[PDB]
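Researcher: Please generate the 3D structure of the following complex. Treat every line as part of one assembly.
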Amino acid sequence: QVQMVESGGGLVRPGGSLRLSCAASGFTFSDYYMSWIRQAPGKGLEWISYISSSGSSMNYADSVKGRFTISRDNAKNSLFLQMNSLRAEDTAVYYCAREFDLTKIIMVPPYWGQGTLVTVSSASTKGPSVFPLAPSSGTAALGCLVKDYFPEPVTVSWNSGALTSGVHTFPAVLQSSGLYSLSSVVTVPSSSLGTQTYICNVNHKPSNTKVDKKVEPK
Amino acid sequence: TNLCPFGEVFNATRFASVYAWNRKRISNCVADYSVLYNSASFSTFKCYGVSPTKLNDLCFTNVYADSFVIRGDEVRQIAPGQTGKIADYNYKLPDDFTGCVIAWNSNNLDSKVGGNYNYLYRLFRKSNLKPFERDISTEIYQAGSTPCNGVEGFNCYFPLQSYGFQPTNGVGYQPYRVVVLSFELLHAPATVCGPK
Amino acid sequence: AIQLTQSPSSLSASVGDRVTITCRASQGISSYLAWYQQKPGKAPKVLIYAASTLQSGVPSRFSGSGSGTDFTLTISSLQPEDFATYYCQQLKSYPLTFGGGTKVEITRTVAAPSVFIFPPSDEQLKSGTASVVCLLNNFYPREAKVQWKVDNALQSGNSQESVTEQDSKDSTYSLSSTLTLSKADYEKHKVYACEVTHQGLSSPVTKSFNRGE
Ligand SMILES: *[C@@H]1O[C@H](CO)[C@@H](O)[C@H](O)[C@H]1NC(C)=O
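Model: Done. Output below.
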């Protein structure tokens, strides 16, 4: 099982510094070239950096040279991206990717992590409040309202991931206050509304908020 | 006369990478090759066509000291007619090699917690080296069928590999300081003699 | 730096149709090409590497072809779960480069929205604002209008909506409009109405409640 997990994302002052970290497992790490690739909100994929398997060569896209530095630790199965002099254009989801295997000569598919979002903003962190969207008064609808948080992202699940059929988590909207808001809703059998338990799990990492709200009738 | 400067060689603060191994020419001096062996802090001391305690009643034109850092499982390669990445692409000893091979563990000087990337070795080469050749080229190596246009990518890899020495490596991956002494007797006045 | 030119930048097609996407490299790159699929809010995933090798798992609806400068990604029978943005990546040489993407939408029959309205919560009222949410579930096409009415007065300036991407099972959309009022204003009125217009309804649907049950 190839696994690549990124960490260290979040809110950074314009002009400040952040250090991303990519933990890898499921393959002999020291055999592979690695890269950082980033995707700005709504844009396409931009490669920015590579380091060779042993750390003897590295290079950077032009939008990033002079400010960022890549590195790796083959003893810890870890890739790193040190980011300095950050600016608004740098706000993106940053991915780590394992590419070429200098051990062999056969083309192998790249493998990517899940991304981490860094936001370059001067505004303050702020955790959400969570409010139930109470159901009916057949198929009933219920949900949760995650209001007034900053920055993105907020993640919602239902019954700790046990409830997945019928969920729609909407895109966050940016209110005039500068804070975000987001709703998540589920359609659920009407009769199950007395028997079955419904909880929404909000997590907003930049403020270390992790809240469970029971959503119930009345 | 004056004493041979083996202390500069063996106790040098910096050691070369093996792909770019350093040659020092020892000349016009008196050397106690016993006092070299007597510092019994050497894990490897193999001599070829000669022996310590016989180097003291012998004279040569020039003595060469080649020095570099490699890793523990590669010391075995610093010997005549050996094969492997170090012996083929970095440092080859000839069949008629006459001299000694002295190595020792240098984990305390040459590892670093994040890894030391200063020490490199060549992993790829179109052709095996000849004895005592040195290749310091940095051109991208074409491992595949398509050219590389001076740039890394699929099957296009910068040949020098980084050792990345860390203090926590197992012994075989720790840095060893190597000195290879080669003794040469041209038809000329000898200038490097033992005290005898 | 090899430049990739991907076409088209967006397309729509029906379930079961054949979808073709192309990538043109500014240089020969022989077979050093991958195709990526990126579903909404997920990371790009490789479908094909080496121009035509299927990654494990990937349904055999997907295939790729080409060599040199011209590559083609084919979904032989478009399925609902194929809604995604697709990219080609050149792998010949660093800096690695990508095509611009191809948003793939699914053409579907018309589906009316199911409408739900949700009063602000007990909790949030204590804070001094009130949020009234209206849900439009599983409709098609995207176009829709929500009008808020408070005691029959049409609201303006105090609603924001967002829409989901096309559902991966039934290719429909969902939309969520939120009306924001101060606690004072909210309590000055009784009837809260969400009026929804959509091509699948014969006449606008209104869903409504009265403050305080
Ligand atoms: C290196 O330094 C040590 C400690 O000062 C000394 O005892 C040793 O003789 C030196 N080695 C040589 C070859 O001079």
